[PDB]
Amino acid sequence: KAAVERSKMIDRNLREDGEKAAREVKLLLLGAGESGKSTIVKQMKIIHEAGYSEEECKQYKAVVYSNTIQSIIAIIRAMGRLKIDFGDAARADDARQLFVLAGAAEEGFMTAELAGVIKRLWKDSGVQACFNRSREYQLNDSAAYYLNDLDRIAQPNYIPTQQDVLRTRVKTTGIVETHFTFKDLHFKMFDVGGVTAIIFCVALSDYDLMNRMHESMKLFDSICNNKWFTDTSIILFLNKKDLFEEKIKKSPLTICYPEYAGSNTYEEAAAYIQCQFEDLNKRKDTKEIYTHFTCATDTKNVQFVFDAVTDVIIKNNLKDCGLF
């Protein structure tokens, strides 16, 4: 039906070489910090261009190291604040050596010695107990990913994989613009860090950490209901569904929504959140919100969701997309 929709247009006929003209789509990426905006951008390069070559991935190695060192130090420092002891008291020396090694370098690095110290600390029961209470302090979301894969990351000849790259946390400053072609549509994607359609990202896992989820709702409320976006397709990405899935097992939605009375399961809890956001639409009869549960780090899921998102654009906004 999208193909049929496109086929009705007659504007290329008005241009001398219309069949060679580029139909443009301006896409804005919005959402609170750390909600996954920049990961969506990487997935576009991976899916619609080449993405990350081994040479490109090599440039992210010290970032992978930096992220790994920050995660462990965060957990170790939290133990102090939360009064949690080491499972085996021999680790207290490793905790100190962690600070000695990190305190003597300027940027991320990895040595056999450092790798040894981190692996022993990570495997400790008191450290694991502190990890399981991460909702109480600031800890990188990719902490377990890198930490559990230390052995591979620690090898002298390590070359970061695409997943290693997608998992990195690199704060964005300034507005970042990316161009890619999908289904013959020329997308100009803006990651407003620091309009045909808008993709609003939400970190579902921020619910049990004003409350973060509520601040995200506040931002979506204003964005979604803004007059400038009256003719823009509003897409909602309820992201980090993989992390939310593991969290909802032991953490209750009531921490975020006290009035929530449904069962504390993935199905009911996720459904509740979607309804909370879509209900902010003050024009439920004139505007439709397009919601997708995503895992921005999963290339396959993002390719699927973006395919669906593109069909909505073709069916809803093609007439407002110019030829260049």
Ligand X SMILES: Nc1nc2c(ncn2[C@@H]2O[C@H](COP(=O)(O)OP(=O)(O)O)[C@@H](O)[C@H]2O)c(=O)[nH]1
CB of 167 to ligand X, least distance (A): 4
User: Binding residue for ligand X (CB under 6 A) from 43, 70, 142, 232?
Assistant: 142
The contacts of residue 149 (CB under 8 Å, 6+ apart) are none
CB of 233 to ligand X, least distance (A): 20
Give yes or no for residue 223 binding ligand X (CB under 6 A): no
**Residues 277/220, Cβ–Cβ less than 8 Å:** yes
Burial label for 7, CB within 10 Å (0-12, 13-18, 19+), is exposed
Q: Is 204 helix (H, G, I), strand (E, B) or coil?
A: helix
Give yes or no for residue 97 binding Mg ion (CB under 5 A): no
Q: How far is CA 2 from the centre of its chain?
A: 28
Give yes or no for residue 172 binding Mg ion (CB under 5 A): yes
**Residue 289 contact partner, candidates ligand X, Mg ion, none, CB within 5 to 8 A by sort of partner:** none
Question: How far does the chain reach from its first CA to its final CA, in angstroms?
Answer: 25
Question: Closer CB to ligand X, residue 78 or residue 295?
Answer: 295
Give yes or no for residue 34 binding ligand X (CB under 6 A): yes
Give yes or no for residue 216 binding Mg ion (CB under 5 A): no
Rg for the chain, CA atoms, rounded: 23
Give yes or no for residue 164 binding ligand X (CB under 6 A): no
Q: In 3D, which of 188, 183, 177, 179 has the Cα closest to residue 27?
A: 188
Give yes or no for residue 192 binding Mg ion (CB under 5 A): no
Beta strand 175-182 with 23-31 is: unpaired
61 labelled ligand-binding:
no
User: Binding residue for ligand X (CB under 6 A) from 161, 172, 264, 274?
Assistant: 172
**Residue 36 contact partner, candidates Mg ion, ligand X, none, CB within 5 to 8 A by sort of partner:** ligand X
**Residue 206 contact partner, candidates Mg ion, ligand X, none, CB within 5 to 8 A by sort of partner:** none
Count of residues interacting with ligand X (CB under 6 A): 23
**Residue 240 contact partner, candidates Mg ion, ligand X, none, CB within 5 to 8 A by sort of partner:** ligand X
The contacts of residue 241 (CB under 8 Å, 6+ apart) are 204, 270, 293, 294, 295
Structure tokens given for 48: 């619609």
Structure tokens given for 81: 């604040």
Give yes or no for residue 206 binding ligand X (CB under 6 A): no
User: Binding residue for ligand X (CB under 6 A) from 296, 305, 309, 313?
Assistant: 296
Structure tokens given for 34: 């750390």
CB of 168 to Mg ion, least distance (A): 10
CA 183/CA 3 separation, integer angstroms: 10
Give yes or no for residue 43 binding Mg ion (CB under 5 A): no
Give yes or no for residue 142 binding Mg ion (CB under 5 A): no
Which DSSP category does 138 fall into?
-
CA 317/CA 211 separation, integer angstroms: 35
Sole window of 36-44, 132-140, 289-297, 313-321 interacting with Mg ion (rule: CB under 5 A): 36-44
User: Binding residue for Mg ion (CB under 5 A) from 26, 35, 36, 38?
Assistant: 38
CA 273/CA 87 separation, integer angstroms: 37
Q: Which residues bind ligand X (CB under 6 A)?
A: 31, 33-39, 141-142, 166-169, 172, 201, 239-240, 242-243, 295-297
> Residues interacting with Mg ion, by CB under 5 A?
38, 172, 193
